[PDB]
């Protein structure tokens, strides 16, 4: 995360997909106003996203499922 991203690369399996997923999560945390799943210790959103990815708590499928659930809750509340 800070010095080496090898664990995140192993978790995802491709450096380019890792960059894309981490950028999506970091933008969710930064502008989207979400909350981190790991204890943020004076870290930027990019490093927090990388640490979440290397911990198994964030990947593309998880982001898709969370997005669909949030959309369903939003449309149920808009009723």
């Amino acid at each position: 995360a800070r010095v080496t991203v090898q664990d995140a690369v192993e978790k995802i399996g491709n450096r380019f997909d890792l960059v894309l997923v981490a950028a999506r999560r970091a933008r969710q945390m930064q502008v989207g106003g979400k909350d981190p799943l790991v204890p943020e210790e004076n870290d930027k959103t990019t490093v927090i996203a990388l640490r979440e990815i290397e911990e198994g708590l964030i990947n593309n499928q998880i982001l898709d499922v969370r997005e669909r659930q949030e959309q369903q809750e939003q449309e149920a509340a808009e009723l």
Partner: protein, 101 residues
Amino acid sequence: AVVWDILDEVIREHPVLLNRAPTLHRLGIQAFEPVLIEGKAIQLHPLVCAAYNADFDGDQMAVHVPLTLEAQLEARALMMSTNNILSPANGEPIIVPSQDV
């Protein structure tokens, strides 16, 4: 005196790109984490000079700042010096010690 604290806060985890001309291979541009120093010269790690083909007798380097989150994550995950340990041409290590070490 508070803008210096702000500046030390904004560069905490924000890579910069160092480049030396001519760029013959892709190891001529690399990414580093900045440490603020007093003076006017850029300090370079002794183990990366061979990748830059650089020596300390008058050479100059250029520094670039990535702006968006994607660029910062590319700098950290692709162009960081701690990822570019092996040589893309032959696979041998390229951060090997030399001279005084």
